[PDB]
Amino acid sequence: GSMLYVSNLPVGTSSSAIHALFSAYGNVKDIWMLSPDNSAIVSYESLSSAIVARDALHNRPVFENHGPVQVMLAKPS
Amino acid sequence: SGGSMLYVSNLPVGTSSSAIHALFSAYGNVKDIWMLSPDNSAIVSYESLSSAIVARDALHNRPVFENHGPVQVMLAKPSSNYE
Numbered sequence: 001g002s003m004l005y006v007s008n009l010p011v012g013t014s015s016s017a018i019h020a021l022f023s024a025y026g027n028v029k030d031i032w033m034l035s036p037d038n039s040a041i042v043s044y045e046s047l048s049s050a051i052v053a054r055d056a057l058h059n060r061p062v063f064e065n066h067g068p069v070q071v072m073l074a075k076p077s
Numbered sequence: 078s079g080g081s082m083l084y085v086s087n088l089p090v091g092t093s094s095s096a097i098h099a100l101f102s103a104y105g106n107v108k109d110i111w112m113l114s115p116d117n118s119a120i121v122s123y124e125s126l127s128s129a130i131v132a133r134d135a136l137h138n139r140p141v142f143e144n145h146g147p148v149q150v151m152l153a154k155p156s157s158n159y160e
Contacts, residue, residue: 005084005113005120015157029160032082032153041082041120041153074111074120077094 001029002050003074006057007039010066018042021062025053041074050074078160080108080122081129082153085136088117089145097121100141104132126155 006018015031018040022028026049032041044050050073058071085097094110101107101121105128111120123129129152137150 003111003120005118019157019159027159030078030156030158032156034084034151034153039084041084072113072116072118075114077110077112 002026002044002047003076004042004044004050004053005039005072005074006042007070007072008067009038009040009069010063011036011038013037013040013063015040021057022053025049025056078158079156080124081126082156083121083123083129083133084118084151084153085121086118086149086151087146088119088148089142090117092117092119092142094119100136101132104128104135 015033018031019028022042027045028042029045030043054071054073057069059068061068094112097110097119098107105123105125108122108124113119133150133152136148138147140147
């Protein structure tokens with residue numbers, strides 16, 4: 001699989017909202033939210049999905065009233 | 078599925094994943110490590126919540142590396158699973 005760290009979300013963003021956003025690019029297996037819900041760890045089934053989602057969403061303001069979201073690839077070891 | 082995630086930030090520049098395992102293995106069985114290079118951050122997983130809490134308490138806001146300011150460790154909430 002692959003994994004992403006997503007930050008600069010609006011405070012209070014729901015895991016459901018993250019799932020909907022990231023499900024367009026792959027099969028989301030798990031989401032961990034970080035308090036106060038302005039960042040999240042997103043796990044995908046396929047290696048390719050994190051790369052495609054990052055290309056789609058990184059540095060874009062996908063939420064109203066808020067700046068661009070940051071999407072970082074989590075490099076496994 | 079399941080398990081606890083720590084988001085670790087303000088690592089010294091050039092900190093490797095092997096160094097991170099060494100540091101976090103003091104508090105339990107590290108399950109996985111991901112590096113957020115080129116940023117000085119990482120993600121550390123433990124299967125046990127109590128290991129993650131103890132690690133977070135021991136390391137958050139602690140200058141654990143020489144000649145470097147305090148490392149940050151944030152425990153994520155329990156995950157949602159979609160499988």
